[PDB]
């Protein structure tokens, strides 16, 4: 003789996909975000085991969409460079250039409209070879000048990642997996409730994951299907490998007027000698880190399997090299000095040459490109390498190569421990209580 009793506020939830918002303590518009809670409430859920899937986490697709939308709203009001798509007369820069930089910079002159719309004037700027394509001979054009709309980024809008906390609407909750050995899928016996995710820096890089979180105990190897060599492997480091990247050229900047109220920011000239941009890592630390990665790789592929690292097999410059944004200056570093080893089952530093280019195509879109304004002076960044994006050749030795390009993996590598659920506070159950 039991009766239906209605209970409101029961701790019940189901998986959900909803709109998440931003909290923060710029390209990412963090000024539009709500303030964070100075004393965040992370609530441990005892005896709660939840199923997680980092490869089916709808927060990664939502973050990717938000990052692109923020990028575009931050470029929409900025100066268009359509008037720059003219024939350039470029010669080689020879002034105080070392052998490593010969041909990397060209002194290009062109006919640009002066401050008045009737008269034209001759101006010049220095360009990187990666931004200059021959027309047919010293006559050059910008790369993808006539096939894409190049937008100049506003020099006053910073590209520095600022941690973005993702917060869930009331009635929803974000569950965090606290299991230090969680490999991205399956049950998590140690789950906690969080209103919002920790601050995730929207770091945009390939091959190497710069900045961000570290593994709590051992290097983590996470893949959708480790036996499928077409999938990426995300390697999460226990300790960071420090990488010191520089642009050792005391650059100047010129403002070339395009029209009323707007300037093109040209590379100007270089004070002093011209040297190639590069990144250094500690050789001993990198080798130790790979030894840890190999030890973890020799858990899936066998104890007596030789693990070999090699450079990228090819493809886009953004993928074959380690691409990153260092103070607004875009670096494309040659990582063949990092992934060049064979690990047998039985102080110093590594210097990675880097190239610089100003016209980039983020998100691999058709018809859109951005021009990175020059930054004056000498650039230096010190970053933490917190993980890798690797692929396996597949087809006794397993060769691993750096990969990237799809930025969802960079966010996925941070969002792997979170899932969004919806709260269902209204439930019914039998009791002996009658109305």
């Amino acid at each position: 003789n039991l009766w239906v009793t209605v209970y409101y506020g029961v701790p019940v939830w189901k998986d959900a996909e909803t709109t998440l918002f931003c909290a923060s303590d710029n390209v990412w518009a963090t000024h539009a975000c709500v303030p964070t809670d100075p004393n965040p409430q992370e609530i441990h859920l005892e005896n709660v085991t939840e199923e997680f899937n980092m490869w089916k986490n709808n927060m990664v697709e939502q973050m990717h969409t938000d990052i692109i939308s923020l990028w575009d709203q931050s470029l929409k009001p900025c100066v268009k460079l359509t008037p720059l798509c003219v024939t350039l007369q470029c010669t080689n820069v020879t002034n105080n250039i070392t052998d490593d930089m010969r041909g990397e910079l060209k002194n290009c002159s062109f006919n640009m409209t002066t401050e008045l719309r009737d008269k034209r004037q001759k101006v010049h700027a220095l360009f990187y070879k990666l931004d200059i394509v021959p027309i047919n001979n010293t006559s050059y054009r910008l790369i993808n000048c006539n096939t894409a709309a190049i937008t100049q980024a506003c020099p006053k809008v910073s590209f520095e990642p600022i941690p973005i906390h993702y917060c869930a609407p009331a009635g929803f909750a974000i569950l965090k997996c606290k299991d230090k050995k969680f490999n991205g899928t399956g049950p998590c016996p140690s789950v906690s409730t969080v209103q919002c995710t920790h601050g995730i820096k929207p770091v945009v890089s390939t091959q190497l994951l710069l900045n961000g979180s570290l593994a709590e105990e051992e290097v983590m190897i996470r893949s959708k299907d480790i036996r499928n060599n077409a999938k990426n492997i995300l390697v999460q480091f226990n300790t960071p490998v420090q990488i010191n990247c520089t642009r050792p050229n005391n650059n100047t900047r010129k403002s070339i007027r395009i029209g009323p109220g707007q300037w093109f920011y040209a590379t100007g000239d270089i004070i002093g000698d011209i040297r190639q941009a590069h990144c250094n890592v500690s050789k001993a630390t990198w080798n130790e880190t790979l030894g840890k990665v190999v030890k973890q790789l020799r858990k899936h592929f066998g104890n007596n399997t030789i693990i070999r690292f090699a450079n990228s097999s090819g493809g886009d410059l953004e993928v074959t090299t380690h691409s990153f944004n260092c103070g607004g200056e875009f670096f494309y570093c040659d990582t063949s000095g990092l992934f060049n080893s064979t690990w047998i089952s039985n102080n110093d530093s590594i210097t990675l040459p880097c190239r610089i280019k100003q016209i980039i195509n983020m998100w691999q879109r058709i018809g859109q490109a951005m021009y990175a304004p020059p930054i004056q002076g000498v650039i230096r960044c010190v970053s933490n390498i917190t993980g890798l994006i690797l692929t396996r050749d597949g087809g006794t030795t397993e060769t691993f190569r750096p990969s990237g390009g799809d930025m969802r993996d960079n966010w996925r590598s941070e969002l792997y421990k979170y899932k969004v659920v919806k709260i269902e506070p209204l439930g019914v159950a039998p009791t002996r209580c009658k109305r």
Partner: antibody
Amino acid sequence: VQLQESGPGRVKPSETLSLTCAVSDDSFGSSYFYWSWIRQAPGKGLEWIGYIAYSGGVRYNPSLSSRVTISRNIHERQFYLRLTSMTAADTAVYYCARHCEDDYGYYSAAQSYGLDSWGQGIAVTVSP
Amino acid sequence: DIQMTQSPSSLSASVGDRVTITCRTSENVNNCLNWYQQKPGKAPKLLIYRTSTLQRGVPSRFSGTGSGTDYTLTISSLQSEDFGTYYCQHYYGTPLTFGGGTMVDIK
């Protein structure tokens, strides 16, 4: 949709084969698509040569990966195959093709996992 | 590399007959198999993009199934146009491979 092969139908021995595949539908700039090169020798089945991913990375057939270069230009909506050291054994019809791996339902409409779009192909003969 | 044995290598059939084509892989491809029909002189046309999920625009007479290393294509009632070489192709990792191909001729 329309994938259009373009390039020389003649390579001399030890020269390089360079083919372009033009994509007309703007899917070249979209995620989870793979742009493949496949060849079919007369009297034989089809051999996958390689592909370039939407991410910009590439994968090659292990038997050809030392000779195959695959690259692309997003803005021009084209991808390229540069196959070095052509010999008599490389005579085949070279096709470009497209497939999607939308494993988690990114697209509102279902995409095909197979090669749902092929070009017409260029028959490449190696001969002095 | 995942090897595929496709059987029969050659099949003669009349219009109205039931046609079954089987692909045997050397390793499990986790249902990542696509079936194609290649008419002479043309690029292969995709028939089925999963083991069983039919490609849009393909007549409902074509179907397929399978798991593990054992996959089949069935033509419920062969028509006058359903002739040519049928192929199986796995996308479970790389390299992507095709079967030898079964030519369907006219009895």
